[PDB]
Ligand binder design. Structure first.
Ligand SMILES: Cc1cc2nc3c(=O)[nH]c(=O)nc-3n(C[C@H](O)[C@H](O)[C@H](O)COP(=O)(O)OP(=O)(O)OC[C@H]3O[C@@H](n4cnc5c(N)ncnc54)[C@H](O)[C@@H]3O)c2cc1C
Length: 371
């Protein structure tokens, strides 16, 4: 059986690994170029690192335990949160724990695992149309941003792992009556950077400016800053705030700078303030979108949506990667239970996963709106 998987993000790569392990003929499509190549300048990394949970790790394990051990070997386990107040005082609240994993390492290592299998990788291919039939599904692509060269191929089924703006989802809406909602959040995030120290810190076991084994949080009124360690001693830092508040700041350089100094006085010693200012000013104005569907599948086991394609969530308050990895594990178990009958498996997936998904996404959304 052949399957076309649309989207080579974290979820798409895991799904491709899972299905190739079960002996399927997998073709993995993404319109981006291969991020492993130095000629690829846009890596499409939404964040440098991620918080992976016990569920997320377990999902990876059940699909390929040897690969999981290899892929996660440099993850950094957190023992608690470190709350920084307005005066820069840090309080340690030991853990619901999470570990820091590098996004590009995770994505690229999964791609590497796929190349040890029969999986066919097709970068630079943009899905534009699917023709649904009772047999094979005809997928139409456009190759390249300039030429948009046509490519077509038939598959037994299609897996939509093409993110919040899923082209597969839209194709499926023509075939089945899908309940669907998209909502643009007022939330904006800005990626910041805490460089590694020059000198090795024996108490931290590396060149870290603050404790590498704590999730750092600067909680404030209607906004917050966080920091999560990387392997090289630096921290990936993120500012979360409303688009209006951010717009009201980026009018002048001095306004942003003063804002940072006033609210996060202890980050001055460890972060390049002027670089931080540029990041506020030149940050992508694209809104975060939350989605929900029902159903997740086309009857007859012809297609299924996983990851952000099926349930894009509010960041921080929701855990999209861990949830998406769990999508894959749950799907594969249903396929096992039904001896490969995708029609029953995909149908039961929708029937049992939807209720859990809506619960999770609503909680994440409700919590962000309570700020
Ligand atoms: C700032 C931030 C921080 C986050 N932190 C965490 C965290 O700590 N822990 C956690 O669990 N989650 C976190 N998340 C959520 C997590 O990043 C996502 O849920 C996860 O990356 C979902 O991956 P995906 O494969 O489903 O979608 P995507 O990463 O969006 O991948 C979809 C892929 O499909 C491709 N594609 C799109 N359209 C087409 C097309 N028509 N044809 C071919 N290919 C196409 C795209 O190129 C893309 O590569 C965070 C999200 C953000 C924004």
């Amino acid at each position: 059986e052949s399957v076309a998987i649309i989207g080579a993000g974290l979820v798409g790569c895991l799904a491709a690994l899972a299905f190739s392990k079960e002996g399927y003929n997998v073709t993995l499509y993404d319109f981006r170029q291969d991020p492993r190549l130095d000629t690829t300048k846009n890596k499409n990394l939404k964040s440098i690192n991620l918080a992976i949970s016990a569920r997320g790790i377990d999902a990876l394990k059940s699909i390929d335990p040897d690969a999981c051990e290899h892929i996660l070997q440099d993850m950094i386990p957190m023992k608690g949160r470190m709350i920084h107040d307005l005066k820069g005082r840090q309080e340690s609240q030991l853990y619901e724990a999470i570990n820091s994993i590098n996004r590009s390492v995770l994505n690229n290592s999964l791609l590497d695992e796929l190349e040890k299998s029969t999986t066919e990788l097709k970068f630079g291919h943009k899905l534009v149309k699917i023709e649904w039939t009772d047999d094979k599904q005809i997928c139409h692509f456009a190759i390249g941003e300039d030429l948009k060269t046509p490519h077509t191929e038939k598959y037994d089924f299609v897996i939509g792992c093409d993110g919040a703006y899923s082209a597969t989802r839209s194709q499926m809406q023509r075939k089945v009556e899908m309940d669907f909602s998209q909502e643009y959040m007022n939330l904006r995030y800005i990626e910041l950077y805490i460089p590694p120290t020059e000198e090795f810190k024996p108490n931290y076991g590396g060149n870290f400016a603050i404790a590498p084994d704590h999730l750092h949080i600067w909680p404030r009124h209607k906004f917050m800053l966080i920091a999560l360690a990387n392997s090289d001693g630096s921290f990936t830092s993120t500012f979360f705030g409303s688009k209006d508040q951010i717009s009201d700041l980026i009018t002048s350089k001095s306004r942003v700078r003063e804002f940072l100094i006033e609210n996060f006085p202890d980050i001055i010693n460890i972060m390049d303030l002027d670089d931080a200012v540029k990041r506020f000013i030149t940050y992508p104005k694209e809104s975060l979108v939350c989605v929900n569907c029902k159903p997740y599948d086309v009857p007859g086991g012809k297609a299924i949506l996983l990851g952000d394609a099926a349930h894009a969530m509010v960041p921080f308050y929701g855990q999209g990667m861990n949830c998406g990895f769990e999508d894959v594990r749950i799907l594969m178990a249903l396929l096992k239970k039904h001896s490969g009958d995708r029609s029953r498996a995909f149908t039961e997936y929708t029937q049992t996963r939807h209720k859990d998904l809506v619960s999770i996404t609503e909680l994440a959304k409700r919590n962000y709106k309570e700020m």
